Write a protein that binds this ligand. Structure first.
Ligand code: NA
Lengths: 517, 294, 85
């Protein structure tokens, strides 16, 4: 009969700070109850009307988060294997949700930033192999399936067969190899054999593969209207939806006889969308991961660059086009030599023979008053005015100064500031997301997406037909031992601080004056 | 003598000098056979590159060049992020523009040239405009297929190039130069600046500790130059075929003990005059004062 | 900072109050003339300038809804732009 959890839930719902901390320190099952307290307080703080009381609830939820961090830090510092059984324990509080899922739902990013939690996610990622095996041994065992039964891959953190092919690293590695073979087949169809009359054998293999990828995205979109709200929420579910919609528009346009070239180009832009998927597939990796995350935070500085450049590119381009007006005055021709010459001049392509009379041969080539010169090039105009050409050379010099020295070196300065400012928060965000990415590979039907139709048939058939108790007591008493040592050391550190020594001296001198008088 | 072979296999530059000599033996052995002259002629060229990169390890002893050579190998994870993001973007751009204006020379190494090797040189300022832009090419009925075609200039650019939707090829050039030359290069400078200012202090601490064993290596070497070093190896082969004062140490150690005692007395005075131990001693004096009243 | 931390609407009526001291000059104009740059750096003052900038719409309406309503004047009378501050 331990009713301490009823008084904990009572003190959390009425927002009593000192009550809820005391009721935490007396009850058991402490790591899960601190994550449950942090979750419940943040849910009720978003639902709060008064601003001061929502601020009060977010301060208390931050206190419970730091206590679960400090307690699990000491439980991990004693024994790694036993603390691993402490996090991964089924349904400690309020339904089947482990401590990692309570840390995920509460947005407790300081709990995932520990070295103990990241070590347990590394052990979970490698399955039932050892987490120190190098990646080349994983590659040699992957491309040689009989080489599993040797002394390269040490196990224990037809049995070794499902110890190799059951780990999340080999579901990842099989997914990457199958996705690169999809791109290699896509490129072979698009660059070598794309017949105008009838689709060949290799293109029908491509259409079959894209049907398997479509059924995979409906399986992650259904396996029901709130689930569609969740699939519409992400940006990369929308991007894989975007790749498949451009694919259907390309194949549907190709099959009509009057629209061959339109589908021929829509599939090329579709190839770019499928290859940018690979930036999201490798966010699970330990070295490439966090750096891919920081790239999307560097895009407000690129947009300042494009703003300042487009103001300056219009100013330079229309001025030099007006100064030496040419004789080919088509609309796309002048849009070429207004926007597209100066954009390539900031990358080192400076055409001097198109806009400088000293490099051109003169002549009476126009039908108008004035002196004219004949440029070289099929797009540079046909005759160019010679009046005030030193001003065109000065506008080139000023353009190269402002574009290549101000804007490029200032952009390097802004990228350096933004990077050193957001780098720490991007590490904290990546570790918290690293749990749910691993859980995605562990929850996937482990069969490669060219051959994944087998598992979708089996799930279609199933859709047509519709610790021990003493081990938990030993575990929780072990946790309560370390909770008491944590709280005693916290009390000794507060008592030996300098300000409470100053309080205790002040009260002793005050009672000394009470003894004299 | 087998544990010494474990030590020689342990280092990376003992392995590299082993690597230079193994490529040398493969080059000389291939040269002497009559049917393999050109193979040894090229293996010795790559071997020349491996011998010249030794000079980066010889000058880690130097006082100015030393620590900076050490920091260079710690900057290689950011180069590998650059090569990852670039290869994703280089395949995306190259296969799209090759598909959009399909050419008529469709050899395998020819299309691998103009898929991987054109865009890699476009990030260094080599932008060939007359090979992929219909406004700069002369048109003509140069193919044997339905559609409008144009004839590029260059022996590797294809022979006929499709004119359909060429404004999309010009837009893919503009987007490529934006992502490659502005994002990836300026972001790489930002990551090198962060990594450098983060690992610079630990690389100084590592270099000073290694600076002892490098000096000891030159002091332990037979001092005769490696063109003429056969003399010292003959002399060591002959030798292999045939098989302070006490009062000065007492004065030294008593001098050390004098400075040990002054060090410990100053450490005790600094701890005693600190503010927290003054606060302890006042607290205990007031407590014994209450014991004297009561 | 504390008057804003209690109630946002009532502190908005506190800054924007006509002629509190020495002629018609509100607290924002006294902060402007004094060069009090630490007073404008608050999150309360910048939130009230965001509400003043958007007029009598809501300050959370995205810019594309403003563009669609600008280039389609009959599209004002729909449920895109929520009014009352
Ligand atoms: Na440059």
């Amino acid at each position: 009969q331990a009713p301490w959890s009823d008084l904990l839930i009572w003190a959390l719902l009425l927002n009593r700070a000192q009550m809820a901390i005391y009721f935490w320190e007396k009850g058991s099952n402490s790591v899960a109850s601190a994550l449950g307290a942090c979750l419940l307080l943040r849910v009720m703080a978003r639902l709060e009307s008064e601003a001061e009381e929502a601020a009060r609830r977010k301060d208390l939820a931050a206190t419970f988060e730091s206590m679960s961090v400090d307690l699990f830090g000491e439980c991990y510092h004693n024994s790694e294997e036993r603390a691993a059984r402490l996090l991964l324990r089924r349904c400690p509080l309020w339904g089947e949700a482990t401590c990692l899922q309570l840390a995920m739902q509460a947005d407790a990013r300081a709990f995932f930033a520990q070295d103990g939690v990241q070590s347990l996610l590394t052990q979970k990622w490698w399955g039932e192999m050892d987490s120190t095996t190098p990646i080349w041994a994983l590659l040699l065992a992957f491309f040689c399936p009989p080489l599993i039964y040797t002394n390269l891959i040490v196990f224990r953190k037809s049995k070794r067969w499902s110890d190799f092919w059951g780990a999340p690293v080999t579901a990842f590695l099989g997914n990457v190899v199958s996705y690169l073979l999809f791109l290699l087949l896509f490129a072979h169809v698009l660059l070598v054999d794309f017949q105008p009359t009838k689709p060949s054998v290799s293109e029908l293999l491509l259409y079959f593969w894209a049907f398997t990828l479509l059924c995979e995205e409906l399986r992650q979109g259904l396996g029901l209207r709130h689930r569609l709200h969740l699939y519409l929420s992400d940006t990369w579910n929308q991007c894989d939806l975007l790749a498949l919609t451009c694919f259907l528009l390309g194949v549907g346009c190709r099959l009509t006889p009057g629209l061959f070239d339109l589908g021929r180009t829509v599939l090329c832009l579709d190839f770019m969308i499928f290859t940018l998927r690979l930036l999201h597939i490798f966010t699970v990796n330990k070295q490439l991961g966090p750096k891919i995350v920081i790239v999307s935070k560097m895009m407000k500085d690129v947009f300042f660059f494009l703003f300042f450049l487009c103001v300056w590119l219009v100013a330079y381009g229309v001025a030099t086009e007006g100064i030496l007006r040419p004789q080919d005055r088509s609309l796309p021709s002048i849009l070429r030599r207004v926007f597209y010459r100066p954009y390539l001049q900031i990358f080192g392509q400076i055409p001097q023979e198109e806009m400088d009379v000293a490099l051109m041969i003169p002549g009476n080539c126009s039908m108008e008053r004035g002196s004219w010169a004949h440029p070289e090039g099929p797009v540079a105009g046909s005759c160019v005015s010679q009046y005030a050409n030193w001003l065109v050379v000065l506008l080139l010099i000023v353009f190269l100064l402002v574009a290549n020295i101000l804007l490029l070196n200032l952009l390097i300065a802004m990228f350096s500031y933004t990077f050193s400012k957001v780098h720490g928060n991007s590490d904290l965000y990546w570790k918290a997301q690293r749990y749910s990415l691993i859980r995605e590979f562990h929850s996937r039907p482990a069969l490669a997406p060219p051959l994944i139709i087998i598992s979708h048939v089996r799930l279609l058939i199933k859709w047509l037909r519709r610790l021990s108790k003493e081990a938990e007591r030993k575990l929780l008493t072990w946790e309560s031992v370390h909770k008491e040592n944590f709280l005693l050391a916290q009390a000794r550190d507060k008592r030996d601080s300098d300000s409470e020594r100053l309080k205790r001296t002040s009260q002793k001198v005050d009672t000394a004056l009470k003894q004299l008088g």
